[PDB]
Design a protein around this ligand. Sequence first.
Ligand SMILES: [Cl-]
Length: 303
Amino acid sequence: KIVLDHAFGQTILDKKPERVATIAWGNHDVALALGIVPVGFSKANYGVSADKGVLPWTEEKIKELNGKANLFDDLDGLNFEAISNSKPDVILAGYSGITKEDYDTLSKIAPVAAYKSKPWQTLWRDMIKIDSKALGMEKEGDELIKNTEARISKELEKHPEIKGKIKGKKVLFTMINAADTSKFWIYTSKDPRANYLTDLGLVFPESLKEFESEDSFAKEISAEEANKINDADVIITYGDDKTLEALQKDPLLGKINAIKNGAVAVIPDNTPLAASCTPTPLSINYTIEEYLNLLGNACKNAK
Ligand SMILES: [Cl-]
């Protein structure tokens, strides 16, 4: 008997689930990484064409398991009918943004593995621990974590010049709308994409604590208040070819130390690399070298 404790109470599984459905980001990759092809998982809403709806590392693993991708058409929100049609024995939502009502509705379909605290606030190691336990594979989950950690360490050790360059650099992950720079998003330390950076040797600036009290996974702040993040050595943001220059020319954002120094890592918007920034055991293997190279080049400019 599997007992799960999460934000909405307790989920009981009578035995290891035969059929596995997942929702939201990343969860399907934990299953796949453990050798399980989901009977259904959320269509990728970012990093790849909706026509395709599945990220390259996920696709690759599915093929390696001789399986096929069954996607829930749920770009606009949870598709309860589709989930129900997959006839699951468990629904992995260890990393997700489900509400009480969502949890109650899903639970009528099958036992739900929900997040521990607040929506979208599950780090990658915790994602594995929650999801792997719900699969009745807790031990395999621990092993998967150690193996993923070793993959990370291997890339860092293998490239000392990148490792030394980013080590101890104070970093913030942000989302900046090029069309409106009067405000932007900063991701909190409880967001997996912000926390992953610490696995790579970077650290959070002092100013991040100021967001410890934020209830959400990210906080939108005014450019008039951007001085707050002058303590970051390097800044990471989604964007494109024009992003850095537009930022450096911005009358308010251009004054920020890291931006002024050109210490900004621009992740190509809506690409696999962008999507990988919320890491999974599969995405890391696939993208870490590429990611480290972008991070290393940006940290080069930290003064
Ligand atoms: Cl190197």
